[PDB]
Amino acid sequence: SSGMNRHTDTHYPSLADKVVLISGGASGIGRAFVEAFVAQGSRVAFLDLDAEAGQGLAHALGANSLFLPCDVRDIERLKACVAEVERTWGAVDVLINNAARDDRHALADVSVEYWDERMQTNLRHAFFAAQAVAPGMARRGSGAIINMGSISWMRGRPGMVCYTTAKAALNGMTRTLARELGGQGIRINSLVPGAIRTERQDGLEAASQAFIDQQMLKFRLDASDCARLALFLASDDSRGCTGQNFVVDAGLSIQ
Amino acid sequence: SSGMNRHTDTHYPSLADKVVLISGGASGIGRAFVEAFVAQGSRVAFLDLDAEAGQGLAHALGANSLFLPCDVRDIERLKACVAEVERTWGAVDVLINNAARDDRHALADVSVEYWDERMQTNLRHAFFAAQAVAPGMARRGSGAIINMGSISWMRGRPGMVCYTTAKAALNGMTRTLARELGGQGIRINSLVPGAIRTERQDAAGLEAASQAFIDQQMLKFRLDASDCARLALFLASDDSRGCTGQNFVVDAGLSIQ
Amino acid sequence: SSGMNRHTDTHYPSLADKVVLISGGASGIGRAFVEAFVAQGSRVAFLDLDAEAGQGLAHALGANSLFLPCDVRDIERLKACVAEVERTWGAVDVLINNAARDDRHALADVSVEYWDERMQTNLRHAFFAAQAVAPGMARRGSGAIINMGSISWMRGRPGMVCYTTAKAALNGMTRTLARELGGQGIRINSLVPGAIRTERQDAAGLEAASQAFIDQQMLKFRLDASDCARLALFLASDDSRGCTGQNFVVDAGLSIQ
Amino acid sequence: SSGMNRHTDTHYPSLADKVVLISGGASGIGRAFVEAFVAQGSRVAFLDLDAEAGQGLAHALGANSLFLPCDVRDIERLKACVAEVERTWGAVDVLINNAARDDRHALADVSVEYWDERMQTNLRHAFFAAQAVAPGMARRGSGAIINMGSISWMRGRPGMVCYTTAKAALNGMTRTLARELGGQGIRINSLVPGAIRTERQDGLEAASQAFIDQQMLKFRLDASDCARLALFLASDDSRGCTGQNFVVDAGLSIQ
Ligand SMILES: O=S(=O)(O)C[C@H]1O[C@@H](O)[C@H](O)[C@@H](O)[C@@H]1O
Ligand SMILES: O=S(=O)(O)C[C@H]1O[C@@H](O)[C@H](O)[C@@H](O)[C@@H]1O
């Protein structure tokens, strides 16, 4: 549907028909992933807590989109969501661990409850999602995982320790998973965005200018920038790339 | 006390009388830290699950050593241990988040409970220990934190996802905490060992695996606990006052292959 | 032309008509770049020392290919090659600094002359080529530079100090040039291959060394020139418009061991 | 002499009597190295182009200091300086490749001559100095090399391409030299300072404040900070450390 952004004019034949699963798929960056892969003729499942946003997006994208309600905190539901995707469409080809919560929080204010919940929301699911997709990928002898990283921990960004720490954790999990699963044909990399303009983000003008001034390239990045990178990392054109970060940040991380 | 490993012949005057707190202090690398700082005239508190090992080591080291029993999974006890150190000796000067569990485990087999507990044992405590020491450090306007890292995740070592992932997490937490707390005078770095010969790590066979480390390393000798302790002393002293947010890798080149 | 490796089935509309300049273009990885961009409807100029290889390849590819003979050590010729490309086709859109010499050499034996020439062959040209393309890019307000990096220095590979040192130098030059030129619309990244099977790299024995790469890699297959070209196309296209200052490693995991 | 800074109160017994060689030793950071190691009872040789500054410093430090005039561009003189140190005191124990020129220069203005000279002044000597000291170290079965790095290339600092590029080059040379020479007992690491206040550096107040605001620790670093790190990297307390960077920058590189 021509009202939904295709994100790129590039055409990746290797993406047609591939089974893509994306967490936090109903808004922002995750929504853009969903749209971009749909536009490449992939069969795209997405998970999200927001049922009405989820169903509206699936309605807009049509029958090559599948919306599954899921609180990623709930690993049991997460593994059921995976099982359901497998039954419908077969083994996942591409997993994008995208779901995350970047609510700001001061070091001194974090309680044990808040820490644990933030870790469950930002880190734990990425591991279990990978664990769930892996055996089916291995049966086929191929598959691709993309962990959404962040330059925040790289730049040592203060004021959201749980989020930055989870993100840092994914940096390592990418490397060890790449080794653990590479022998099975599965490649795992991390897509690492800079400051991406989305609806959810936000004096807005002022903060946007500060990003431009800090960046090497003097324009704002958006969700399309992420999705273009994702398509490449999913396609057969990145077949030899594993264990690695790919940073799309207009230079924000190098200051 | 006359039989104790001092770990180095170096003397750091800035370490005398400093309050040092170390988790997993009763054996292996943690024990070496405790000995080394004691030998520099620091006041060293240490936490460990093993009460008998803890009390024997504190008895051997004497009155500038303080052993507090603590399961680091238990945040409430962790915070009580800190508060007790503070009441005894004042604000902590040096925190070393050392406690960890590197038991091997297969990716495919990890359950939700195993994951959570491994994360609590390897990661969570390091944040809360930091949070507990911070206010007292800030009141003074100075302090140092050392997070024990690992080259395992850097080398993408398989077969212990929870441990390597926690270690990678500490890599990030170092950087953000360094920024968040630096305005208060607190510096935070990660000490990142390679393959350290210890009693646990030990437990040809052993000989063969030890040779493979030497063959893979750039320097052809086995690193031990003392190598870690010497690095820790430097990172605690006034000679590293300006260093923060950073890794310091003591690995004889194992991570560069 | 009907017999030519296209390298990928992907189609990048943004690459059509773009002016692509590639050093060491006549063989191996450089030749693959030339073929791949030609297959996307780019206008591709390439530089190489080997005149007969160069002219045959341009003859095989046709009128959207332009071969300029060039010794990259000779900066004057390098700048003349650039100016000639500019006059033919306009401002370069994509520069790929690919020319290099990875001949093995012992640390202890390197002379002052060998060092200088190896640095001129492996490093110097990449800066001057960048400097030559920059003004034309800036006039348009857009452009992309790709510096061929190597995992060799990352893995601290011995036995070719000048090559690994040049490659490490490019790692830094990428970052500073990205900042220095980004205000003009120019993005700059490094494509960093692992162990690429080529005719030269080839020249059990071969079989045994090839197996050792597979055993050391995370993905159990040999990478080739096409793997590099596919990465290059992405880094040149509008799909990487926002990426700058960065490494992109295509190494099947060889650098993480 | 109590007019010359000792830089630290720490005492490293393993440094007593060790033969230390430092390039660009007569001013700024290099001078501080010379003073600090002298104060630890090392036998310290230093190289510098400035003969009067060199001789004044050697005069202040006494007979455990040795000043050799040397233009590091001249590799022949560099290798003679090394040979002379070896003859006087024996094999070098510690080499600090410090000599460098950080004159600012725009990308478009660099000529071929300027590039080559900057590379000879900033990079080439570090390799040849290492090559010269190595065989003597290997005979003994021990030695330590410290390459002065810089966070400038890490932070992608514009406006001095030759300097930042040389510095980046040393980052790699450290790793490969560590492997090449490790089997001989020689360790090689890079000491990587942030923005160090020296006499040569420099509205000065304003620029100094901007460094404090950018840094995680809110004080200015000085030459002493570098020397304290150098002593550790030279001593037996870092015996197991090789191939690595050690960054002393108050957090400036993580922004
Ligand atoms: O061999 S590495 O994993 O590269 C380095 C070492 O890291 C440690 O934290 C592990 O507990 C060791 O078992 C391991 O040997
Ligand atoms: O084996 S690595 O040195 O780690 C990767 C590869 O890097 C290339 O630039 C070298 O020219 C190859 O000869 C080498 O195989």
Q: What is the 3-state secondary structure (H, E, C) of chain A?
A: CCCCCCCCCCECHHHCCCEEEEECCCCHHHHHHHHHHHCCCCEEEEEECCHHHHHHHHHHHCCCEEEEECCCCCHHHHHHHHHHHHHHHCCCCEEEECCCCCCCECHHHCCHHHHHHHHHHHHHHHHHHHHHHHHHHHHHCCEEEEEECCHHHHCCCCCEHHHHHHHHHHHHHHHHHHHHHHCCCEEEEEEEECCEECCCCCCHHHHHHHHHHHCCCCCCEEHHHHHHHHHHHHCHHHCCCCCCEEEECCCCCCC
Question: In CATH, what number does C14-250 get?
Answer: 3.40.50.720
Place of tokens 């809110």: D218
Task: Report strand pairing: C143-148 vs C186-193.
Answer: parallel
* Residue positions counted in chain B: 257
Domain ranges, ordered by start, for chain A: 14-248
CB atoms within 10 A of CB C4: 15
CA D240, CA B249: separation in Å to the nearest integer?
9
* DSSP element (H, E) containing B68: strand B65-69
Report CA torsion sign: D1, D2, D5, D6: positive
- D155 to chain A, closest Cα gap in Å: 5
The C-alpha atoms of residue A40 and residue A11 are separated, in whole angstroms, by 7
Which residues does C102 contact at the CB level (< 8 Å), separation at least 6? C150, C152, C160, C163
- Opening angle at CA B202, ends B196 and B207, nearest 5: 95
Q: Which residues contact A13 (CB under 8 A, 6 or more apart)?
A: C9, C10
Sheet bearing D143-148, strands edge to edge: D65-69, D43-48, D19-23, D94-97, D143-148, D186-193, D245-248
Among the listed residues A145, A157, A168, A158, the one whose alpha carbon sits nearest the alpha carbon of residue A243: A145
How do strand B196-197 and strand A65-69 relate by DSSP bridges?
unpaired
Backbone angles phi, psi at A191, to 5 degrees: -95, 125
- Nearest-atom index, ligand 1, CA of B150: 9
Strand partners, C11: A11
Three-state secondary structure string covering D68-112: EECCCCCHHHHHHHHHHHHHHHCCCCEEEECCCCCCCECHHHCCH
Number of H helices, E strands in chain D: 9, 9
Query: Smallest Cβ distance to D254: which of A155, A216, A251?
Result: A155
End-to-end CA distance of chain A: 40
Helix C225-236, helix C28-38: angle, nearest 10? 50
| Order of strands, sheet of A65-69, starting from the edge strand that comes earlier in the sequence | A65-69, A43-48, A19-23, A94-97, A143-148, A186-193, A245-248
In CATH terms, the superfamily for domain B15-250 is NAD(P)-binding Rossmann-like Domain (3.40.50.720)
Q: Give CA angle at A70 (A65, A72), nearest 5°.
A: 120
Nearest to B36 by CA among B251, B255, B237: B237
CA distances (Å), A227 to each of A1, A196, B177, C10, in order? 18, 11, 31, 16
List the residue whose alpha carbon is closest to atom 3 of ligand 2.
Answer: C152
Looking at chain D, the residues that come just before a C–N gap of over 2.5 A are 202
d(CA A174, CA C127): 33
Instruction: Report how far apart, in Å, the C-alpha atoms of B128 and of each of B74, B83, C239 are.
Output: 10, 13, 42
Q: Which residue has the tokens 């997709």?
A: A133
Instruction: Identify whether the C-beta of residue A156 lies closer than 8 Å to the C-beta of residue B179.
Output: yes
* CA-based torsion, B6, B11, B13, B14: positive or negative: negative
Q: Decide: C246 and C190 in contact? Cβ < 8 Å.
A: yes
CA distance C168 to C156: 10
Cα distance between residue B162 and residue B109, in whole Å: 12
- Say if CB C19 and CB C91 are below 8 A apart: yes
Q: Measure in Å the smallest separation between the Cα of B142 and chain D Cα atoms.
A: 10
- How far is Cα A253 from Cα D155, in angstroms, rounded to an integer? 8
Q: Where are the alpha helices (DSSP H) in D90-199?
A: 112-119, 125-140, 151-154, 161-182
Check if A56 contacts C (Cβ < 8 Å): no
| Experimental structure resolution, Å | 1.9
Measured between CA atoms, the residue of chain C closest to residue A223 is C242
Which DSSP category does D237 fall into?
G
Q: How far apart are CA C220 and CA D117, in angstroms?
A: 45
* Token output for D49: 């182009």
Q: Which of A133, A127, A40 is CA-nearest to residue A89? A: A133
C57 vs C198: CA distance, rounded Å = 17
Give the whole-angstrom CA distance, residue A166 versus residue A124: 9
Q: Is D145 on the interface with C (CB under 8 A)?
A: no
Task: State the Cα–Cα distance between residues D117 and D103, nearest whole angstrom.
Answer: 12
DSSP-assigned letter for residue B245: S
Chain-centre distance for alpha carbon C173: 14
- Give helix A125-140 / helix A161-182 axis angle, nearest 10°: 20
Q: What span, in angstroms and rounded, lies between the C-alpha atoms of A201 and D242?
A: 44
d(CA C131, CA B65): 62
C-alpha span between A4 and B109 (Å, rounded): 41
- Alpha carbons C79 and C225: distance in angstroms, whole number: 27
Q: How far apart are CA A241 and CA C223, in angstroms?
A: 10
Q: How far is C238 from chain A (nearest CA, A)?
A: 8
Interface contact B169-A168, CB threshold 8 A: yes
Q: Kind and range of the H or E element at D209?
A: helix D204-214
Please name the fold of domain A14-248: Rossmann fold (3.40.50)
Instruction: Beginning with the edge strand found earlier in the chain, give each strand of the sheet holding C43-48 in spatial order.
Output: C65-69, C43-48, C19-23, C94-97, C143-148, C186-193, C247-250
CA pseudo-torsion sign C212, C216, C219, C223: negative
Token couple for A116: 């644990």
* 3-class secondary-structure state, position D251: coil
Look at the block and give the residue holding tokens 């994100």.
A7
CB-based contact C178:A216 (threshold 8 Å): yes
CB within 8 Å of A164: residues ≥ 6 apart: A150, A152, A153, A157, B172, B173, B175, B176
Query: What is the count of residue pairs from B and D with beta carbons less than 8 Å apart?
Result: 132
Q: Which atom of ligand 2 is nearest to the CA of C213?
A: 1
Q: Tokens at residue A134, please?
A: 């892996």
Does B256 touch chain C if contact means CB atoms closer than 8 Å? yes
Separation between Cα atoms, residue D233 and residue D215, nearest integer Å: 24
> By C-alpha distance, which of A101, A52, A93 is closest to A72?
A101
SS3 readout for chain C? CCCCCCCCCCECHHHCCCEEEEECCCCHHHHHHHHHHHCCCCEEEEEECCHHHHHHHHHHHCCCEEEEECCCCCHHHHHHHHHHHHHHHCCCCEEEECCCCCCCECHHHCCHHHHHHHHHHHHHHHHHHHHHHHHHHHHHCCEEEEEECCCCCCCCCCCEHHHHHHHHHHHHHHHHHHHHHHCCCEEEEEEEECCEECHHHHCCCHHHHHHHHHHHCCCCCCEEHHHHHHHHHHHHCHHHCCCCCCEEEECCCCCCC
Instruction: Decide if C135 touches A, using CB distance below 8 A.
Output: no
d(CA A80, CA A64): 20
Task: Indicate the SS3 state at residue B159.
Answer: coil
Chain B residue at shortest CA distance from C256 = B155
- End-to-end Cα spacing for chain D: 40
Chain-centroid distance, C-alpha D111: 27
Residue A202, C-beta contacts closer than 8 angstroms, at least 6 positions apart = none
Residue nearest to atom 9 of ligand 1 (CA): B150
- Looking at chain B, list the stretches that DSSP marks H as alpha helix, in order from N- to C-terminal side: 28-38, 51-61, 75-89, 112-119, 125-140, 161-182, 199-202, 206-216, 225-236
Please, which residues have CB within 8 angstroms of residue A7's CB and are 6 or more apart in sequence?
A32, A35, A36, A39, A223, A224, A227, A228, A231
Kindly identify the ligand whose nearest atom is closest to the C-alpha of B193: 1
Structure-token pair, residue A17: 């028909």
Identify the CATH class of D14-241: alpha beta
Name the residue with tokens 């395992």.
B152
Judge whether D242 and D189 are in contact, CB under 8 Å: yes
- The Cα D106–Cα D102 span in angstroms is 12
| Cβ–Cβ < 8 Å for D67, D122 | no
CB B25 within 8 A of CB B31: yes
Element (H, E) at D61: helix D51-61
CB B222 within 8 A of CB B213: yes
Nearest CA in chain D to C173: D165
* Helix (H), strand (E) at residue D211: helix D204-214
Contacts of A176 (CB under 8 A, 6+ apart): B152, B153, B156, B157, B158, B161, B164, B165
Q: Which amino acid is at D247?
A: V
* Amino acid making up residue B142: S
Question: Cα–Cα distance between D130 and C165 in angstroms, integer?
Answer: 14
Cβ pair D153:C176 closer than 8 A: yes
What are the respective helix, strand and coil percentages of chain D, to the nearest 5?
Answer: 50, 20, 35
| Exposed e or buried b per residue across A109-134, where buried means at least 16 C-beta atoms within 10 angstroms of its C-beta | ebeeeebbebbbbbbbbbbbbbbbbb
Structure-token pair, residue A240: 């030899």
User: For ligand 2, what atom is nearest to the CA of residue C154?
Assistant: 4
**CA pair distance D106, D151, nearest whole angstrom:** 19
- Helix axis angle, B51-61 to B28-38, nearest 10°: 20
Pick from A116, A118, A136, A147: nearest CA to A234: A147
Which residues touch B17 (CB under 8 Å, ≥6 apart)? B41, B42, B43
Contact at 8 Å (CB) between A86 and A92?
yes
Give all chains having 3 or more CB-to-CB distances under 8 Å with chain B.
A, C, D
Nearest to A26 by CA among A56, A59, A64, A54: A54
Cα D145 to Cα A28, C28, C129, D82, distances in angstroms: 50, 37, 34, 14
Q: How far is CA B69 from CA B24, B26, B50, B72, in A?
A: 10, 10, 7, 9
Instruction: Report the distance separating Cα A222 and Cα A7, nearest Å.
Output: 10
Count the Cβ atoms, other than its own, within 10 Å of residue C88. 12
- Encoded tokens for C64: 């959207």
Which of C9, B61, B4, D76 is closest to A235 using CA atoms?
A: C9
Kindly give the distance from the C-alpha atom of residue B199 to the centroid of ligand 1, in angstroms, as a whole number.
Answer: 14
Tell me the two tokens of residue B254. 């194992």
């241990």: which residue's tokens?
Answer: B81
C60's tokens: 């095989």
Terminal Cα-to-Cα distance of chain C (whole angstroms): 41
Inspect the interface and report whether the beta carbons of D107 and C157 lie closer than 8 Å: no
Residue D39: CA atoms inside 13 Å, Cβ hemisphere, count?
21
Placement of tokens 């009067």 in the chain: D52
In chain B, what is the straight-line distance between the N-terminal and C-terminal CA atoms, in Å? 41
Neighbour tally for D11: CB within 10 Å: 16
